[PDB]
């Protein structure tokens, strides 16, 4: 009767495809065909943050748009002052194999994780000025690929064990697990309202999740390979995904479809990081060919290139005020652009 | 007039960078190793064992609680001194799976500069099975000859050495299909009880660092 269930699944996905095509009235290219191009976006390196010994895997801005956290495989978390280029904190980690890091929206905690399968939370504001390990969230059976704070007490974690988890930090327990992906999850992205997050995995699929209900609302396909990066559009009704198929794609929740493809014939490397500008007009994508491209999210045109890294671009972040973009690389350097 | 906060931030920066210079000195003296297999008492998500040979520090990492899909977390080990690849020389075709995995690690665009120390183990069982099966998996064996540049160890028939060297050649075919000088395969022979394995790893790491230094010191 497994064949019966496979038949039912194939007919259901055919129904889903027909319902999706019934909504594809006009391509985004046809609706933004008369809007003005953005021209040539030329950005300059304003800061080069040195101090890391090994390759940088993660980088998160603070909500103050001034402080940064970066994770390198030497085993250090550095908290940067982007304006003065100074180092505020350097946190040695128990495991040097950190793959992700996350700055808390309050500014009081910082999380990291990696091949230890543990989300370590660090207190940044202690009465003696010491940075301590507040909590070690264990329970994932695979590596920890992305961390994102909901508030000071809740964090969302993606894993190589194909599951995402919502943690209660004070209790150190796993409140809800999000199953449904088939490959290891690579990146998460929270919505601006913190009620929905989107997940990107190594099965060419992206899933929308209800943080409270614990269920998968929508599943988005269209990529040919593993999705390495995902980011919500500022409105919260769309998101961009970058894959190892040398392509970034704009999806829309309310249409349940893909709206735009960001690809060029001479780009044959995977996308490692994507981020939107404050307006959502630009789409900064980090690539394996050592530089970042700036896309016109509405016209699928390439508006600029951020060259200046001599190894793989791993990290890419835009400040909440939209003032500057930060890039991390395997050459062990953080650069800030404007 | 808050120059106080600025000078305090610069003093904190000075302390941080002093600690960074010292831990940089400690980082450059430690040699990372990845233990990929098909040893724990030789001498969570990842286990770490520290050794010491001739006052040199080595940190070996074997992957623990990870799923068998490796293509994403194997990019973290692109800066290690060497990947130690342990093969049980020989109910599935585990030797061909080993060859496939070695080919994937060898031709990965991120491990393109990472040398591999190959350990072909389980040679007691290999011997007693050769005398008594491998030619049910490799047809070129029944028409293969032991090379002349091979060690004549005392006591063992040409049959077991033929099997050993055929498997070593199966790996060296992958290793030399590239032909570019960027990373090397050091094939070794392991037994059930050995002591020179750490010496072999140390010598191969000395060789890898020396080649890197020839490249770095504009001597190549």
């Amino acid at each position: 009767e497994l064949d019966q269930l496979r038949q039912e699944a194939e007919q259901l996905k055919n129904q889903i495809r027909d319902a999706r095509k019934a909504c594809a009235d006009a391509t985004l290219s046809q609706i933004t065909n008369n809007i003005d191009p953005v021209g040539r976006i030329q950005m300059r390196t304003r800061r080069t943050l040195r101090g890391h010994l090994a390759k940088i895997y993660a980088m998160h801005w603070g909500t103050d748009s001034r402080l940064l956290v970066s994770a390198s495989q030497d085993g250090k978390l550095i908290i940067w002052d982007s304006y003065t280029t100074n180092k505020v904190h350097a946190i040695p980690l128990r495991s040097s194999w950190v793959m992700t890091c996350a700055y808390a929206p309050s500014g009081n905690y910082v999380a990291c994780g990696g091949l230890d399968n543990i989300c370590s939370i660090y207190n940044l504001k202690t009465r003696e000025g010491n940075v301590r390990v507040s909590r070690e969230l264990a329970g994932h059976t695979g590596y920890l690929s992305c961390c994102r704070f909901l508030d000071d007490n809740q964090i969302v974690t993606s894993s190589g064990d194909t599951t995402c988890a919502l943690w209660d930090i004070e209790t150190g327990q796993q409140t809800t697990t999000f199953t449904g992906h088939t490959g290891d999850v690579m990146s998460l992205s929270l919505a601006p309202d913190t009620r929905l997050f989107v997940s990107g995995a190594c099965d060419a699929s992206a899933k929308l999740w209800d943080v409270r209900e614990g269920m998968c609302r929508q599943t988005f396909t269209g990529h040919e390979s593993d999705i390495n990066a995902i980011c919500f559009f500022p409105n919260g009704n769309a998101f961009a995904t970058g894959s190892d198929d040398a392509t970034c794609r704009l999806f829309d929740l309310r249409a349940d479809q893909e709206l735009m493809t960001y690809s060029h014939d001479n780009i044959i490397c995977g996308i490692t990081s994507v981020s939107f500008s404050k307006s959502g007009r630009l789409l900064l994508a980090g690539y394996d060919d050592f530089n970042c491209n700036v896309w016109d999210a509405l016209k699928a045109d390439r508006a600029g290139v951020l060259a200046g890294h001599d190894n793989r671009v791993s990290c890419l972040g835009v400040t909440d005020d939209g003032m500057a973009v930060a890039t991390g690389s395997w050459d062990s350097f953080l650069k800030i652009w404007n | 007039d808050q120059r106080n906060e600025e000078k305090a931030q610069r003093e904190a920066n000075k302390k941080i960078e002093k600690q960074l210079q010292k831990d940089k000195q400690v980082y450059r003296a430690t040699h990372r190793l990845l233990l990929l297999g098909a040893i724990v008492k030789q001498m969570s998500g990842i286990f770490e064992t520290k050794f010491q040979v001739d006052k040199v520090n080595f940190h070996m990492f074997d992957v623990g609680a990870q799923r068998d899909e490796r293509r994403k977390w194997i990019q973290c080990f692109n800066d290690v001194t060497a990947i130690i690849f342990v093969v049980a020389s020989s109910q599935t075709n585990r030797l061909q799976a080993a060859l496939k995995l070695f080919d994937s690690i060898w031709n990965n665009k991120w491990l393109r500069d990472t040398s591999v120390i190959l350990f072909l183990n389980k040679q007691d069982l290999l011997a007693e099975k050769v005398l008594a099966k491998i030619e049910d998996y490799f047809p070129e064996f029944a028409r293969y000859t032991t090379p002349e540049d091979a060690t004549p160890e005392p006591g063992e028939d040409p049959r077991v050495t033929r099997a050993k060297y055929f498997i070593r050649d199966e790996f060296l075919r992958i290793s030399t299909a590239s032909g570019d000088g960027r990373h090397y395969c050091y094939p070794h022979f392991t037994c059930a009880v050995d002591t020179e394995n750490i010496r072999r790893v140390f010598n191969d790491c000395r060789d890898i660092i020396q080649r890197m230094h020839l490249r770095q010191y504009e001597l190549l």
Partner: nanobody
Amino acid sequence: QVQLQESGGGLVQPGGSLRLSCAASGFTFSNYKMNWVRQAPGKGLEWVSDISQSGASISYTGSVKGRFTISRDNAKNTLYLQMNSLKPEDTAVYYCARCPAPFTRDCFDVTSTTYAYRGQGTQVTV
């Protein structure tokens, strides 16, 4: 959506021949290396064959050399496995595995766990 449909299996006399076919959709077929992976009744997944993006580099596992042959038609998005002189050792489920990323020379796709870019397979019985 990446799909790989395998067809052509069935029951064959010891010594006969088959032709498995793999219909691909949802990706640029000519950009990826394709494979054939096997799963015997009580054993794990074993690799069988491997063809390059163009069809020039071809490799087989040793137990099937001379007997099996692999080909691809990039114009029709299809992969073929012509099997000759079948033995009862060849009784298994034959999957069509695509390598994870395009324009590469490495693949990690024989995982007993769920590998994503692999069809549901066809059964060959001898």
